[PDB]
Amino acid sequence: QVHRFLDQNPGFADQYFGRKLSPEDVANACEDGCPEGCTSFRELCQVEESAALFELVQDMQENVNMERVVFKILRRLCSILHADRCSLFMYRQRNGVAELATRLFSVQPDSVLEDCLVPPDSEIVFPLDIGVVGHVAQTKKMVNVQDVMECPHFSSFADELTDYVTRNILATPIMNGKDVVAVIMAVNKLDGPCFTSEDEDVFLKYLNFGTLNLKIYHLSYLHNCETRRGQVLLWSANKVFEELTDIERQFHKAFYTVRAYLNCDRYSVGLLDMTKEKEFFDVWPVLMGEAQAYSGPRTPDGREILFYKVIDYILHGKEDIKVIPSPPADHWALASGLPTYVAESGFICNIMNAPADEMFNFQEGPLDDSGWIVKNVLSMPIVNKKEEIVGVATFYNRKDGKPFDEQDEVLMESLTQFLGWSVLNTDTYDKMNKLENRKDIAQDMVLYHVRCDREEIQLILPTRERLGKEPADCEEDELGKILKEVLPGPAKFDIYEFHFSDLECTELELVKCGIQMYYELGVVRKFQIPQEVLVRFLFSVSKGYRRITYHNWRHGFNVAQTMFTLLMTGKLKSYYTDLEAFAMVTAGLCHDIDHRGTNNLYQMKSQNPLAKLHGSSILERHHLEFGKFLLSEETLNIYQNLNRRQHEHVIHLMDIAIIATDLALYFKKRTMFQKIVDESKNYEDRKSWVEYLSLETTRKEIVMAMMMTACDLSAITKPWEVQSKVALLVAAEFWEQGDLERTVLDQQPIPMMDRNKAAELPKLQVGFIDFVCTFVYKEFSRFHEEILPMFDRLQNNRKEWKALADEYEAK
Amino acid sequence: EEVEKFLDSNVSFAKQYYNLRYRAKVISDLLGPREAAVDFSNYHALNSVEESEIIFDLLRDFQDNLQAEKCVFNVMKKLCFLLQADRMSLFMYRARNGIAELATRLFNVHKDAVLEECLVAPDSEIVFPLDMGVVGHVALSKKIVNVPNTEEDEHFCDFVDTLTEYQTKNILASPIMNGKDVVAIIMVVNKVDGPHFTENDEEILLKYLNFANLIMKVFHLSYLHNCETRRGQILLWSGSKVFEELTDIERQFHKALYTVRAFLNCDRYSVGLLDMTKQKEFFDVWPVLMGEAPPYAGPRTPDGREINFYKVIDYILHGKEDIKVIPNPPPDHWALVSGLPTYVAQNGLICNIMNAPSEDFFAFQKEPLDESGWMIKNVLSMPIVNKKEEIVGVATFYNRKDGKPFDEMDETLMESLTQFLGWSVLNPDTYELMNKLENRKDIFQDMVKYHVKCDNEEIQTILKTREVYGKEPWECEEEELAEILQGELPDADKYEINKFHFSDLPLTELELVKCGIQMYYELKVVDKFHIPQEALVRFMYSLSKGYRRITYHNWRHGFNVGQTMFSLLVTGKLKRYFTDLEALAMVTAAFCHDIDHRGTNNLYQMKSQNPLAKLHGSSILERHHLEFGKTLLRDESLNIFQNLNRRQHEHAIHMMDIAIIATDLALYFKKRTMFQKIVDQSKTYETQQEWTQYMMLDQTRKEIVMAMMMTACDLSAITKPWEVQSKVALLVAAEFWEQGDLERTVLQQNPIPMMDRNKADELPKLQVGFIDFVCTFVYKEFSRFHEEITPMLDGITNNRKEWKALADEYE
Amino acid sequence: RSATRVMGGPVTPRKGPPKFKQRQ
Amino acid sequence: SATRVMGGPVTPRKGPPKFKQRQ
Ligand SMILES: CCCOc1ccc(S(=O)(=O)NCC[C@H]2CCCN2C)cc1-c1nc(=O)c2c([nH]1)c(CCC)nn2C
Ligand SMILES: CCCOc1ccc(S(=O)(=O)NCC[C@H]2CCCN2C)cc1-c1nc(=O)c2c([nH]1)c(CCC)nn2C
Ligand SMILES: Nc1nc2c(ncn2[C@@H]2O[C@@H]3COP(=O)(O)O[C@H]3[C@H]2O)c(=O)[nH]1
Ligand SMILES: Nc1nc2c(ncn2[C@@H]2O[C@@H]3COP(=O)(O)O[C@H]3[C@H]2O)c(=O)[nH]1
Ligand SMILES: [Mg+2]
Ligand SMILES: [Mg+2]
Ligand SMILES: [Zn+2]
Ligand SMILES: [Zn+2]
């Protein structure tokens, strides 16, 4: 009525409203003495706005009132901007391209949330280059359009879609510091030309509250998404490091555990073949035309894209997991062709509205039952550190019905990136198995060449000639009867004497004597050793030694024989039981068990695999290792009738005995044995000393460790005729290693290992006697007077070498 | 005047008109940078105007970037006036070491204060445990607490009153609650009106705590979001560096911690690695047991190891970045002086320390370690634990970059890092098992090489260099070696080595080896490729040793296959299609085809799960022989192809892989048709020369012909005269019956009639079935190909007649 | 009905070849 | 300062430390 009057006279309107108002109000207005707040109704607006705004502040405090609060704000934002409609477009990024999807649509002052909330399937999506929304979201600044027609970016998609036509548009981007959350637009109903500058200011100041609620909502969503990603990486890493397994088991474990955090209805993992070339017989048919060359898709590496396994996860209504060994081309995950396309390109694919996609074939309608249709898909390639795609992981409908956004893309990409990197744990697992298999084959190949077969065992047993049966078919009494008729007596080859010489015996005779030594100890009957195993083991040990100058089977028997004569003739058996004497003789036999003819120093210099495998005391750990390996075989296990306690004790002693043959350990523990000898002298008789030493374990080990050192160097104690010959074999082996160092390593060898200094052999032998041999035999002779013959002969040998050394000094 | 009456009569009509035009102006002015027009320098109840202005002023603080402390302080200043309280304070909720505490953030807030006078620095922090007075009571109660009269009403503390020389009688506090976790506690002390606080003040506090709750909610979410983002990056970056390579523990840990140094937000942090040795060797235990050295008495890890840091990695990020690795750190190392890493290793507990110098339990450095005065203020130490629940190392993190103590979020961040590192100890363990397994395999492979390679003593049985020249073979010239071999190698014509009826029965293995070298000579490949005579003799002798001493597949079978191939090239004239290089590899491949045959079938390797089966999924023994034959050829003393250039070597090898694998019968049955096409096409050429010239060019058909020629040679024993065949048969059947027995005893399976001893008398029937099914096609086509291989077809036809006669007798 | 007058699919004015993300 | 503490954070109760267990 009179509205046009007060429009044409702004001065009168300001003057009338500047008048104070009587206390009489119109409707409540929370009239706590506010009729004249510097304007007729400014205070009434002040109180009403404050009460309404404060109620909004209360609403944001609870939880998920985001949409409710924004809708109330837009309801109040209208009718103060006089906009016809107000809408909210949320910002999201997929495939690296930003989009603005509608969440709230036209909001009249009398609307309700149900009439304005936009379900995700009913939303309108805009990119950044279409419409004013893309203009607002790209420049991150306000846009005020006074006329839609003159706008250069306006899009009429929504105008024709609904029915409405737009004239004035006012939009802002709601800013979370650096990122964009949403865009709010107000449209038309200006009743004038356009939005004024006063509407420009009110829009920003009033919407700061909307930024607050949207910032809280955006932060809450970002915090939740990051929390899930952290747990995904933690749980995935937990299952990867549980054990070394193949790619199938490892991927199945990681994907199954993170099924809760992934938040997807279904997802399938397909594994690609890793073969690069084919064998010759697979290439021939295509070369002669019997078959056609491959014409399908190829990986960027050049492999034929073949899914050799597909792991299917179903979480829609019932947790069902399937593993398909040969997935056919009609498989639901593979029928779309997206996993094949991903393998072709290696690109991260995000699809919204799958049934409306024409690039791929998504079956419009329900899969399985319960009307499950594909709506949103996300697929990423699983790539190892070699930039090769090992699989494709496809993720299906989100559980809340929303399209896959940037946060989801980062979540699964991190999971696939982590699982792609952890293929190294599967490559190592395969190469683990091959190395283990190759080692086991080589062990069997060694075992055949060292074990005594059926034909060679008939040199000591002859069961065929005497009974006609194989040794495995003969009883123990029959085997014992034949061995008695074959094995030499104790009085034939001087096995009980310190002056035993092997130069008058053949290799077979040494083996027969070696079995005889076991019979004299009484360990065969006591521990129930099968005779066939004992004969096979001794013959196998003979084969184990190389055919080298000095450290050959004859040296191995000579050490064992001296150990046997130390126990029985030297009366050191008083401190040990039959089980301990069992281990010592066996450890003597196997102490140089494919000794290669070079010392530990050469192994370090030449970087032999022995030096790498064993840190220190190499070639004694190796001799211990191979000797144990031979005993582990069923047909060579002489300890196979010993219980767990006895077997462990014997194995423990063999470790001590064989390793103590190293001269470095003998030098370090030399004084420890001397104290033991001195403690013996403090006793009054051998009976009391025996009872004290036979119970101490550490003292017995040190004495027994020293027994090996005396046995190993026992060739020195031999009579001069034997010693002179043996010393030449030892020198020849040293000179052979001296030549090897000169040629292979281009190093000057020590005078001990120099062919040109062969005339210094007598002098060095005396130095060896005065430095190593003298201590052991002097104390053992002091310890037991029965070993005194060894010391007497050692001194005699030193006299002979000294005579030669002085003779060389003469010239 | 009339309009004045109309507006005055209808006051309501003037209202919405004012709302239509003068509402935007009011809102814009109020929300702008304006100060509340309320006389705060007084004490009275506020009407609607003043209440609205206070609300609007609090709304005006919701601008962007949300400075949390300033906005909360503004709410506090208003609450001072509204609540009529004297002072206000704020206590941030904090949790460290699993226990909760409250730390002062704003203190002594009155209505006439500024932010700087009330903000609390971390050094001036007051920390209150939850088990203390009103501050702790509110946090546990999670409800408004009104101490109405004095301090005699339970849970009151006097510390701050004595500390700040202040008196507190009236308290009204309320906690700021972020859903289910407490963020901060707001409190008032005293009340300058008289008798304490009424229920009105509690309502006022609840009304105006809405703004403070929103501000802290944003502040809490941003901190949580930042912490979770850092945890995701830490796990991802650590995973990337862990899986880059398979390295030891020190290198792997150094890479991971250095990469994530940006996200840790610490000034210094160091990692000390504990020794993992659980048991000492025997020689190191002896001195302790004998009293030479005292036993260990220091601290021990929970699993029972001596706490010994052998390596410490130090990271310094003060501003001059420095990373150091200290092997065997001294006990007075700056990180280890406090004893905290020792304490962590002893107990295995996560330790969080605030005010390190004031902590009397640990001897922390109270002096500035750096020249810039870098105090040690906050320390956090956690143990690194592998999957065996043992402690691998101790990770210690020093002062945070922001100066605040390590709260529960820092502990969680580093705990995930140490959990990830502790799990990733699996990779170094596999790397150590990697080197040991590889070295063990190489050691055993070298062991086989000795047992198979011919030595200097055995080579003299053929080369005889000592008898003729007196020198060793490696010293004699090539002409001298040729002259000896000419007088030693047998004459080709006399032995008929290039005939299809040659028999090895009246020859010894040494004569077979001499024959083999002669066939190499007769191909004129020794002089053309400059093959060294010593290597050629050593290679052939080692091939003799490589074949096992079994019934049929011994070295005699290997020579017969090799001899047949030599005859096929020479007598059969199949050399006309092949080059001299290929004929050299083809003959050599025949000699090595069944090299280390174990006397068992390929199917047996499947069933028994041999290490061969696991290593080669496909045709097994053919691949195993190929690998072993190459291994012998790689050795220097056995390398015949050592004088071939790069191109010729690969071609020679390539023929060796195809030829050896072609000996598999499964491959023959698939490609026998393609060979039929090749031989059928050979008849479409006018002259033999035309066909030959075509065959020299095509390589695929040359390979197929060679692959078939391996099959003919492998089964060539069937074409020998009936006298030779009658003994070769029942000599391979003996091998089959041995495998049949193995399957019965080992696999508890009934063998096929081919493998069955009980059907021995039925053998001739199977041979006819074998001839009519496998061998007939091989030689019928070859005889069609070349007329010179007719004797092979004549031989097998005669043999089938004899076998059929035997089968007829049995029926 | 929804205020956007769109049922059963999030329509988009942008018509063209879909663009897919590249691995980092 | 506001809390009248220059040196460092102060707590009313100073006893033996309590340490967190591993997960
Ligand atoms: C036959 C000619 C060699 O005779 C020798 C000459 C000298 C020495 S040495 O006191 O100098 N030790 C070597 C230490 C090195 C380094 C420093 C100086 N020195 C040169 C020992 C021997 C020696 N003689 C032996 O008969 C003999 C052995 N050694 C051995 C174990 C040798 C692995 N077994 N057997 C049976
Ligand atoms: C003379 C002793 C009888 O021995 C046989 C008895 C039967 C047959 S079979 O083909 O009909 N069944 C074998 C195939 C299996 C699988 C499919 C069905 N079938 C059951 C062959 C042989 C056979 N004879 C040989 O002389 C002979 C060999 N086999 C071989 C191995 C090839 C290096 N070498 N050599 C020289
Ligand atoms: N029917 C309707 N259309 C709107 C609404 N808000 C904006 N639009 C129009 O939809 C257009 C889509 O984005 P534009 O940038 O092209 O500009 C938009 C406006 O013209 C609304 O709340 N309802
Ligand atoms: N002395 C003092 N105490 C305050 C102040 N503000 C809050 N308080 C609290 O007064 C509380 C009284 O005892 P508490 O145990 O609850 O812990 C005390 C302080 O936290 C202040 O400005 N001065
Ligand atoms: Mg030795
Ligand atoms: Mg074979
Ligand atoms: Zn020895
Ligand atoms: Zn063969």
**Closest residue to B56, CB basis, from A50, A285, A440:** A50
CB of residue A183 inside a 6 A radius of ligand 3:
no
Please classify residue A810 by burial: count the beta carbons closer than 10 Å to its beta carbon, then call 0-12 exposed, 13-18 middle and 19+ buried.
exposed
**Residue B424, amino acid:** S
Note the ligand closest to the C-alpha atom of A103.
3
Q: Which residue of chain A has the CA closest to B700?
A: A284
Q: How far apart are CA B544 and CA B524, in angstroms?
A: 23
Note the ligand closest to the C-alpha atom of A664.
1
CATH of domain B14-16+19-225: 3.30.450.40
Tell me, in angstroms, the distance from the centre of ligand 5 to residue A776's CA: 17
Place of tokens 């220097």: B636
CB of A453 less than 8 A from some CB of B: yes
Q: Give the resolution in Å.
A: 3.0
Tell me, in angstroms, the distance from the centre of ligand 8 to residue B717's CA: 10
Please classify residue A8 by burial: count the beta carbons closer than 10 Å to its beta carbon, then call 0-12 exposed, 13-18 middle and 19+ buried.
exposed
Instruction: Say whether A712 counts as a known binding-site residue.
Output: yes
Pairwise CB contact (< 8 Å): C14 & A351: no
Cα atoms in the 13 Å half-sphere on the side-chain side of A60: 28
Phi, psi at B748, each rounded to 5°: 55, 45
Q: List, chain by chain if needed, residues with CB within 6 Å of any ligand 2 atom.
A: B 665, 714-715, 717-718, 729, 732-733, 752, 754, 763, 766-767, 769-770, 773-774
Assess whether chains D and B touch, using the rule of 3 or more C-beta pairs within 8 angstroms: yes
**In a shared domain, residues A206 and A240:** no
Neighbours of B, requiring at least 3 CB pairs below 8 Å, are: A, D
The minimum CA-CA distance between A652 and chain C, rounded to whole Å, is 57
Catalytic hit among A218, A551, A622, A784: A551
**In a shared domain, residues A108 and A55:** yes
Return residue ranges of chain B for CATH 1.10.1300.10. Answer: 456-811
Q: Hey, what CATH class is B456-811 in?
A: mainly alpha
CB of A209 less than 8 A from some CB of B: yes
The gap between the terminal CA atoms of chain D, to the nearest Å, is: 40
Give, as residue ranges, everything with CB less than 5 Å from ion ligand 6. B 594, 663
- Whether A97 is covered by a domain: the verdict is yes
When divided into structural domains, chain A yields a total of 3
Phi, psi at A438, each rounded to 5°: -65, -40
CB of residue A131 inside a 6 A radius of ligand 3:
yes
**In a shared domain, residues A527 and A540:** yes
Q: How far apart are CA A714 and CA A708, in angstroms?
A: 9
Task: Report the atom number in ligand 3 closest to the C-alpha of A133.
Answer: 15
**Residue B301, amino acid:** T
The vertex-A41 CA angle with A40 and A43, nearest 5°, equals 110
**Closest residue to C21, CB basis, from A96, A99, A352:** A96
3-state helix, strand, coil in chain A (%, to 5): 55, 10, 35
Neighbours of B273 (CB within 10 A): 21
The enclosing domain of A101 has a CATH number of 3.30.450.40
Instruction: Say whether B407 counts as a known binding-site residue.
Output: no
- Whether A439 is covered by a domain: the verdict is no
Phi, psi at B144, each rounded to 5°: -55, 135
The answer to whether residues B296 and B415 touch, using CB atoms and an 8 Å cutoff, is no
CB of residue A597 inside a 6 A radius of ligand 1:
no
For chains B and D, count residue pairs whose Cβ atoms are closer than 8 Å.
97
CB of A355 less than 8 A from some CB of C: yes
Atom 10 of ligand 2, residue of closest alpha carbon: B770
The vertex-A11 CA angle with A10 and A13, nearest 5°, equals 65
- Whether A16 is covered by a domain: the verdict is no
- DSSP SS3 for B767: helix
Task: Report the atom number in ligand 2 closest to the C-alpha of B717.
Answer: 36
User: DSSP characters for A582-599?
Assistant: HHHHHHHHTSSSS--S--
Q: How far apart are CA B633 and CA B645, in angstroms?
A: 15
The answer to whether residues A561 and A521 touch, using CB atoms and an 8 Å cutoff, is no
CB of B211 less than 8 A from some CB of A: yes
Place of tokens 């030493």: A693
Q: How far apart are CA A227 and CA A221, in angstroms?
A: 10
Instruction: Say whether A82 counts as a known binding-site residue.
Output: no
Q: How far is CA B240 from CA A419, B13, B563, in A?
A: 10, 72, 58
**In a shared domain, residues A266 and A370:** yes
The enclosing domain of A628 has a CATH number of 1.10.1300.10
- DSSP SS3 for B625: helix
- Whether A735 is covered by a domain: the verdict is yes
- Whether A32 is covered by a domain: the verdict is no
Write down the H helix ranges in B453-579.
456-459, 465-468, 478-488, 492-495, 509-522, 533-546, 555-570
Place of tokens 């906050």: B378
**In a shared domain, residues A212 and A230:** no
- DSSP SS3 for A126: strand
User: DSSP characters for A371-397?
Assistant: TB---EEEEEEEE-TTS-EEEEEEE--
CB of B162 less than 8 A from some CB of D: no
Pairwise CB contact (< 8 Å): D19 & B97: yes
CB of A759 less than 8 A from some CB of C: no
CB of residue B216 inside a 6 A radius of ligand 4:
no
The answer to whether residues A131 and A157 touch, using CB atoms and an 8 Å cutoff, is yes
Secondary structure element (H or E) that encloses residue A443, with its range: helix A424-450
Q: How far apart are CA A514 and CA A562, in angstroms?
A: 12
**Closest residue to B121, CB basis, from D1, D12, D19:** D1
- Burial string for B537-560 (b: 16+ CB within 10 Å, else e) reads bbbbbbbbbbbbebbbbbbbbbbb
How far is CA B594 from its chain centroid? 38
The minimum CA-CA distance between A249 and chain C, rounded to whole Å, is 25
Q: Which long-range contacts (CB under 8 A, 24 or more apart) does A726-734 make?
A: A726/A550, A727/A761, A727/A765, A729/A549, A729/A550, A730/A549, A730/A550, A731/A758, A731/A761, A732/A549, A732/A550, A733/A548, A733/A549, A733/A550, A733/A551, A733/A597
Neighbours of A470 (CB within 10 A): 14
Instruction: Say whether B593 counts as a known binding-site residue.
Output: yes
Out of B551, B766, B771, B803, mutate this one to test ligand 2's pocket (max ligand atoms within 8 Å of CB): namely B766
Closest CA to A534 of A516, A551, A521: A516
**In a shared domain, residues A590 and A681:** yes
- Whether A193 is covered by a domain: the verdict is yes
CB of residue A254 inside a 6 A radius of ligand 3:
no
- Whether A190 is covered by a domain: the verdict is yes
Tell me, in angstroms, the distance from the centre of ligand 5 to residue A656's CA: 13
3-state helix, strand, coil in chain C (%, to 5): 0, 5, 95
**In a shared domain, residues A566 and A672:** yes
Phi, psi at A800, each rounded to 5°: -65, -45
Tell me which of A222, A242, A262 is where a domain ends. Answer: A222
Pairwise CB contact (< 8 Å): B159 & D12: yes
Evaluate the CA torsion angle A226, A227, A231, A234 in order and state its sign: positive
Which of chain D's residues have a Cβ under 8 Å away from the Cβ of B132? Answer: 12-13
Dihedral angle computed from the Cα positions of residues B403, B404, B406 and B407, in that order, rounded to the nearest 10 degrees: -160
Return residue ranges of chain B for CATH 3.30.450.40. Answer: 14-16+19-225, 228-434
**In a shared domain, residues A205 and A232:** no
User: DSSP characters for B306-336?
Assistant: B--EEEEEEEE-SSS-EEEEEES--TT-TTT
Superfamily covering domain B228-434: GAF domain (3.30.450.40)
Catalytic residue numbers of B read 553
Counting DSSP H helices and E strands in chain C, the numbers are 0, 0
Angle, nearest 10°, between helix axes B11-21 and A10-18? 120
Please classify residue A184 by burial: count the beta carbons closer than 10 Å to its beta carbon, then call 0-12 exposed, 13-18 middle and 19+ buried.
buried
Q: Which residue of chain A has the CA closest to C7?
A: A122
Mutate to test the interface with C, among A86, A99, A104, A125 (most CBs of C within 10 A): A125
Pairwise CB contact (< 8 Å): C5 & A161: yes
Q: How far apart are CA B452 and CA A445, in angstroms?
A: 10
Question: Which method was used?
Answer: cryo-EM
**Residue B134, amino acid:** V
Q: Which domain holds residue A668?
A: 456-811
Q: Which of residues 268-287 of A touch B (CB under 8 A)?
A: 279-281, 284-285, 287
Out of B124, B131, B135, B172, mutate this one to test ligand 4's pocket (max ligand atoms within 8 Å of CB): namely B135
The gap between the terminal CA atoms of chain B, to the nearest Å, is: 143
User: Which residue precedes each gap in chain A (C to N above 2.5 Å)?
Assistant: none
**In a shared domain, residues A145 and A236:** no
- Whether A629 is covered by a domain: the verdict is yes
Q: How far apart are CA B483 and CA B464, in angstroms?
A: 11
**In a shared domain, residues A204 and A232:** no
- Burial string for B86-111 (b: 16+ CB within 10 Å, else e) reads bbbbbbbbbbbbeebbbbbbbbbbeb
Q: How far apart are CA B180 and CA B173, in angstroms?
A: 18
Phi, psi at A176, each rounded to 5°: -100, 65
**In a shared domain, residues A718 and A693:** yes
Which of chain B's residues have a Cβ under 8 Å away from the Cβ of D7? Answer: 123
B309-316, strands of its sheet edge to edge: B322-327, B309-316, B268-274, B391-397, B378-385, B351-354
Dihedral angle computed from the Cα positions of residues A753, A756, A762 and A767, in that order, rounded to the nearest 10 degrees: -40
The minimum CA-CA distance between D9 and chain B, rounded to whole Å, is 5
Q: Residue A321 contacts by C-beta under 8 Å, 6 or more apart in sequence?
A: A256, A311, A312, A313, A314
Q: Which two tokens stand for residue B715?
A: 């089964």
**Residue A88, amino acid:** L
Secondary structure element (H or E) that encloses residue A796, with its range: helix A788-810
Angle, nearest 10°, between helix axes B23-31 and A42-60? 60
The answer to whether residues A228 and A263 touch, using CB atoms and an 8 Å cutoff, is yes
Neighbours of B794 (CB within 10 A): 14
Radius of gyration of chain C (CA): 14
CB of B416 less than 8 A from some CB of D: no
CB of D13 less than 8 A from some CB of B: yes
| Bridge partners of residue A187, in order along the sequence | A85, A169
**Closest residue to A226, CB basis, from B232, B457, B704:** B232
**Closest residue to C20, CB basis, from A99, A120, A348:** A348
Pairwise CB contact (< 8 Å): A216 & B218: yes
**In a shared domain, residues A463 and A554:** yes
